[PDB]
Amino acid sequence: PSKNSINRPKLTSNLHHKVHSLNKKRAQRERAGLLKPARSSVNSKSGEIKSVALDLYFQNKKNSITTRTLSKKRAKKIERNLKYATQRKLLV
Amino acid sequence: SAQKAPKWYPSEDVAALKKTRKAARPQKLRASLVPGTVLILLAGRFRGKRVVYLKHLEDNTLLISGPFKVNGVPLRRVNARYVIATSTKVSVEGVNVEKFNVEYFAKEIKAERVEDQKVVDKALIAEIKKTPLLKQYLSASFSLKNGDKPHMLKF
Amino acid sequence: AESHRLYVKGKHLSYQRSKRVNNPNVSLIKIEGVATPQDAQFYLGKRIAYVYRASKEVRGSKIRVMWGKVTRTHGNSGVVRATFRNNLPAKTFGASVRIFLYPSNI
Amino acid sequence: GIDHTSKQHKRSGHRTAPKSDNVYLKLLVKLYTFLARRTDAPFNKVVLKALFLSKINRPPV
Amino acid sequence: VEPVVVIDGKGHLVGRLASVVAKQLLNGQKIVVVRAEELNISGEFFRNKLKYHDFLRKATAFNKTRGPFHFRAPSRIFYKALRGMVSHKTARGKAALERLKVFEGIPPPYDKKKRVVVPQALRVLRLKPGRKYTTLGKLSTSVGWKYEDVVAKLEAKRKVSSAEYYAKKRAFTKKVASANATAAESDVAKQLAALGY
Amino acid sequence: ASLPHPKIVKKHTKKFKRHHSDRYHRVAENWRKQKGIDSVVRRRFRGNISQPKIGYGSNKKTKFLSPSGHKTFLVANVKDLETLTMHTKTYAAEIAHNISAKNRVVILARAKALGIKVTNPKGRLAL
RNA sequence: GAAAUUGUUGAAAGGGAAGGGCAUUUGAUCAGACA
RNA sequence: GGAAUACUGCCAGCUGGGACUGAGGACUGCGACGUAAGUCAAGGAUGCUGGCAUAAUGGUUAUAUGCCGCCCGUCUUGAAA
RNA sequence: AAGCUCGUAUCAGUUUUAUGAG
RNA sequence: GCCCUGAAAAUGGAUGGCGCUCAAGCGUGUUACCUAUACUCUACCGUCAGGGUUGAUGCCCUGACGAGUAGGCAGGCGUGGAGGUCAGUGACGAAGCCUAGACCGUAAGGUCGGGUCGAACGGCCUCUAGUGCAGAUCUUGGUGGUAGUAGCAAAUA
RNA sequence: UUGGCGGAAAGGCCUUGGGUGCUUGCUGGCGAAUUGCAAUGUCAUUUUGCGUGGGGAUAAAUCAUUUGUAUACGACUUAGA
Ligand SMILES: [Mg+2]
Ligand SMILES: [Mg+2]
Ligand SMILES: [Mg+2]
Ligand SMILES: [Mg+2]
Ligand SMILES: [Mg+2]
Ligand SMILES: [Mg+2]
Ligand SMILES: [Mg+2]
Ligand SMILES: [Mg+2]
Ligand SMILES: [Mg+2]
Ligand SMILES: [Mg+2]
Ligand SMILES: [Mg+2]
Ligand SMILES: [Mg+2]
Ligand SMILES: [Mg+2]
Ligand SMILES: [Mg+2]
Ligand SMILES: [Mg+2]
């Protein structure tokens, strides 16, 4: 506590406020959908390849401010490699 | 080559285990756990309830009954380390519990359970009614009060 | 009735320590109503739970548990030593724990 | 702590092995190792020891 | 065994009371101390006044407002004694100190609450008879505390009200004890006596 | 589907970081022994970092084993893979980092046919 | 197209330094094993 | 006069509660209980049961808490000085 | 660190006995 | 025996702090208790020693040990280039670089995933050296804090 | 709902009357099971959120301009529908 007010709790009140604030912010982020889903969720990528480029390519094929962009060089390479995979799937 | 093949490999034959000198001898229960004793359940769904101990089973579990007419606890298994044995005992010579065992309780309402419950509960009620306040005692639940000391409490 | 408690209240005092190093693997526990080591011998081997709350739900509950057990008495005044599966977080020095009555010898 | 009366981790030595990389010499050393282990004959012990010696210690006869 | 323990500071010795309260706070108990002006320090009044003037000597030379802060009130004297026994620069120590409240007199709501004593800190149980002792209110007044008369008048008013309350409670106690006596001859009372009640 | 083994014990799971690598960017984390005559880390004063030594050596019966119980063998092609045809319970194949996706498909098919576990089967083969 | 150094965004911590060790809570995030 | 008890010691006397550990991996040995076939606590843990089957245990990472930790190198007994 | 030996061999920051000194 | 006096300067400060008076002081006696990298037992690592054994500088059994500067011996990790080999890797992406991801080594280090990128490069047996950096008021280049700061006020406008 | 008292930080203490529930003071009749032998096995006030609504109230401060009782700059102190 403070020397100017010894009967008033200070650190405990600050800690209580901080805990409540962090819990509220975590709930808000979860509701906004910025957290990963459960491991067994259908849209979970656990155990699979994680790629910004492939996510962007498939989102654009499916049809705010972000720093995730996909270059045309990588997009053309993804198109070429997908045609390779499709030819293999047809031949098998 | 990404890696040179090692010269020596471990054998793929699984070894056998050695012969074990650990025989299963029967459990020796606590001296205070006698058939007919009233027990306090310390854990589970029926925690804090007072039941009647009937039989020691082959899986080291105790068969108990409420009886179901008194406090609604059916014929169940409990672990002996999760009950507290009291000083109160009812007469158990009129109860036939030869049918109940591990196979009886295996889960892989049946109404065989219900009829057996009634058959045991009849003789249990007949003996319970002899001691005054015993039915009310079995219907009431156990809990710790303020200042109770389990290391000094007598049961 | 008005009370449903089946445990004894306890306080997490501190870790096992000398004057200038602590051992987080062992907690010191003060059980309510226990004033001598001979009294505390009743509680050796009993299960202990530290029961706490969190905002994020996990498997259908906001209540979380750290489990442990009483191992031996400590000192002359009735304090015991305890070991938990995961060590207690040291923010709980002075927090409450529950000592259950199982496994039972009565 | 222990008050050691002798030196710790001290090698006996006695020239356990030959320093040559000659395959034929290593074969002879293997044969006389078997003989000196399985016969309890002092001759085989002496031959096995003499197979480990250096050139300046193996003068001609 | 209470969520909050109210300790009447009258007749207690400052250091032994501060030791027990510091330990109780660190073990996690909420404590309210009342009547800090009736606390006692062993030793004669001039000795304790000399010690406080030594404390008053201590101050930062280049800036007196940075220095040790000399609080004159009896509750603050006890608080200094207690904070010396708590490791108050750590978060654990601060959290312990925030489980304590210290008051002069008995302000609301504690005046209608139960107040306990600490036998290991009581002067009549600890000091050998004939040894001199000081009282915190007089010490504080001599070193600059200015509210001894206000607290004394408020304490007198509280005592009048509490005395009227105790008179009513005593009359009701007599009635209940009387009516409980006449049921002691029934079979229920005999059975209760056989069981120990 | 590995050979049975004792439960794997690691005496020191933390990385041994070089002293003052947290303090200076020019000092990398790769372990170096302090050679200074007055070094508190060299002299083993209380409260300093732990130094690598042979007492931390792992059990010889669980050494080099993955959590599933296999040893990792690097493979570059099907011929390298087939060296593990009889050591299925003790070795798992890891495809080298510079193998193309087209050859990784062939290696994975051969491994499935032979029953050989592959440590990194998702590499370069996103569907 | 590295590092020092810098901007924006997101997350966090902060009552006269920060950094490090042991241990655990919380939040974020993640692999294996799944007959 | 005749007992008892304390104190100290001994028992290849009996027995209740708690904690940590379970290395080894066909057999081989020394023994014990039995008239015997066999059995055993005798050259290192087995049996029975439940829940979960995934972020649940665990790892990593950002931090919080308790305790510990002075800035390295060089040079001089020695160095925060 | 290397050789030749020996290995009831070589001994010993110790005591004992005998015999000096104090 | 205990107590008081038996001399003291000069910023505010110290039985470590709080404080303590039938002590939490002093002398002594009896027990209980706390905890070191010490002692006992077990596991694991390495070293040494003693044994056994027709991938044998391997395997197995047994016992005991582990401080360390100058210094010594030994086994290993990494780099440029050379001979041999894997009919090795590679435009379905070599090398390099970034990485809240994964694993193996006591460690030197090694390995895998993602992103970026665009043309070469590795494992093993050996050969060879201009072969490993935190320092040298080290060399060359680049960049911070200081800081939107000091200041941009002689010569009349 | 009737009345009284409490200012030390009163925020509480006592009291009138009727209404509406329970009462284990005593005697009865139904129910409980499968959470499977434990797993805190979740139980207590306040709610800057929203939908329903019946009622209540319709401000200032700062910049800019301005004074000099003020002033390095901020700040201060004045004035203006
Ligand atoms: Mg040692
Ligand atoms: Mg460019
Ligand atoms: Mg950078
Ligand atoms: Mg965890
Ligand atoms: Mg320190
Ligand atoms: Mg002391
Ligand atoms: Mg004494
Ligand atoms: Mg590449
Ligand atoms: Mg050079
Ligand atoms: Mg450099
Ligand atoms: Mg250097
Ligand atoms: Mg320089
Ligand atoms: Mg320069
Ligand atoms: Mg300027
Ligand atoms: Mg001019």
UniProtKB/Swiss-Prot annotation, chain C:
SUPFAM superfamilies: Translation proteins. GO terms for biological process: cytoplasmic translation; ribosomal large subunit assembly; ribosomal large subunit biogenesis; rRNA processing. There is a cross-link at residue 46 (Glycyl lysine isopeptide (Lys-Gly) (interchain with G-Cter in ubiquitin)). It is found in: Cytoplasm. InterPro entries: Ribosomal_eL33 (IPR001780), Ribosomal_eL33_CS (IPR018266), Ribosomal_eL33_sf (IPR038661), Transl_B-barrel_sf (IPR009000). Keywords: Acetylation, Cytoplasm, Isopeptide bond, Ribonucleoprotein, Ribosomal protein, Ubl conjugation. Its main location: cytoplasm. It comes from the Eukaryota. N-terminally acetylated by acetyltransferase NatA. One of its GO terms (cellular component) is cytosol. GO terms for molecular function: structural constituent of ribosome. The modification N-acetylalanine is found at residue 1. Component of the ribosome, a large ribonucleoprotein complex responsible for the synthesis of proteins in the cell. The small ribosomal subunit (SSU) binds messenger RNAs (mRNAs) and translates the encoded message by selecting cognate aminoacyl-transfer RNA (tRNA) molecules. The large subunit (LSU) contains the ribosomal catalytic site termed the peptidyl transferase center (PTC), which catalyzes the formation of peptide bonds, thereby polymerizing the amino acids delivered by tRNAs into a polypeptide chain. Belongs to the eukaryotic ribosomal protein eL33 family. PANTHER family: 60S RIBOSOMAL PROTEIN L35A (PTHR10902). There are 2 genes for eL33 in yeast. This is Large ribosomal subunit protein eL33A.
UniProtKB/Swiss-Prot annotation, chain D:
It comes from the Eukaryota. The modification N6,N6,N6-trimethyllysine is found at residue 49. It is found in: Cytoplasm. Component of the ribosome, a large ribonucleoprotein complex responsible for the synthesis of proteins in the cell. The small ribosomal subunit (SSU) binds messenger RNAs (mRNAs) and translates the encoded message by selecting cognate aminoacyl-transfer RNA (tRNA) molecules. The large subunit (LSU) contains the ribosomal catalytic site termed the peptidyl transferase center (PTC), which catalyzes the formation of peptide bonds, thereby polymerizing the amino acids delivered by tRNAs into a polypeptide chain. Belongs to the eukaryotic ribosomal protein eL18 family. Component of the large ribosomal subunit (LSU). Mature yeast ribosomes consist of a small (40S) and a large (60S) subunit. The 40S small subunit contains 1 molecule of ribosomal RNA (18S rRNA) and 33 different proteins (encoded by 57 genes). The large 60S subunit contains 3 rRNA molecules (25S, 5.8S and 5S rRNA) and 46 different proteins (encoded by 81 genes). eL18 interacts with NAP1. There are 2 genes for eL18 in yeast. This is Large ribosomal subunit protein eL18A. The gene is RPL18A. The chain holds residues 2 to 62 of 186 of the full protein.
Swiss-Prot record, chain E:
There is a cross-link at residue 175 (Glycyl lysine isopeptide (Lys-Gly) (interchain with G-Cter in ubiquitin)). SUPFAM superfamilies: Ribosomal protein L13. One of its GO terms (molecular function) is structural constituent of ribosome. The keyword Ubl conjugation applies. It comes from the Eukaryota. N-terminally acetylated by acetyltransferase NatA. Component of the large ribosomal subunit (LSU). Mature yeast ribosomes consist of a small (40S) and a large (60S) subunit. The 40S small subunit contains 1 molecule of ribosomal RNA (18S rRNA) and 33 different proteins (encoded by 57 genes). The large 60S subunit contains 3 rRNA molecules (25S, 5.8S and 5S rRNA) and 46 different proteins (encoded by 81 genes). This is Large ribosomal subunit protein uL13A.
Swiss-Prot record, chain F:
The modification Phosphoserine is found at residue 39. The keyword Phosphoprotein applies. It comes from the Eukaryota. GO terms for molecular function: structural constituent of ribosome. It is found in: Cytoplasm. Keywords: Cytoplasm, Phosphoprotein, Ribonucleoprotein, Ribosomal protein. GO terms for cellular component: cytoplasm; cytosol; cytosolic large ribosomal subunit. Pfam families: Ribosomal_L32e (PF01655). PROSITE patterns: RIBOSOMAL_L32E (PS00580). GO terms for biological process: cytoplasmic translation. Its main location: cytoplasm. Belongs to the eukaryotic ribosomal protein eL32 family. Component of the ribosome, a large ribonucleoprotein complex responsible for the synthesis of proteins in the cell. The small ribosomal subunit (SSU) binds messenger RNAs (mRNAs) and translates the encoded message by selecting cognate aminoacyl-transfer RNA (tRNA) molecules. The large subunit (LSU) contains the ribosomal catalytic site termed the peptidyl transferase center (PTC), which catalyzes the formation of peptide bonds, thereby polymerizing the amino acids delivered by tRNAs into a polypeptide chain. Component of the large ribosomal subunit (LSU). Mature yeast ribosomes consist of a small (40S) and a large (60S) subunit. The 40S small subunit contains 1 molecule of ribosomal RNA (18S rRNA) and 33 different proteins (encoded by 57 genes). The large 60S subunit contains 3 rRNA molecules (25S, 5.8S and 5S rRNA) and 46 different proteins (encoded by 81 genes). This is Large ribosomal subunit protein eL32. The gene is RPL32.
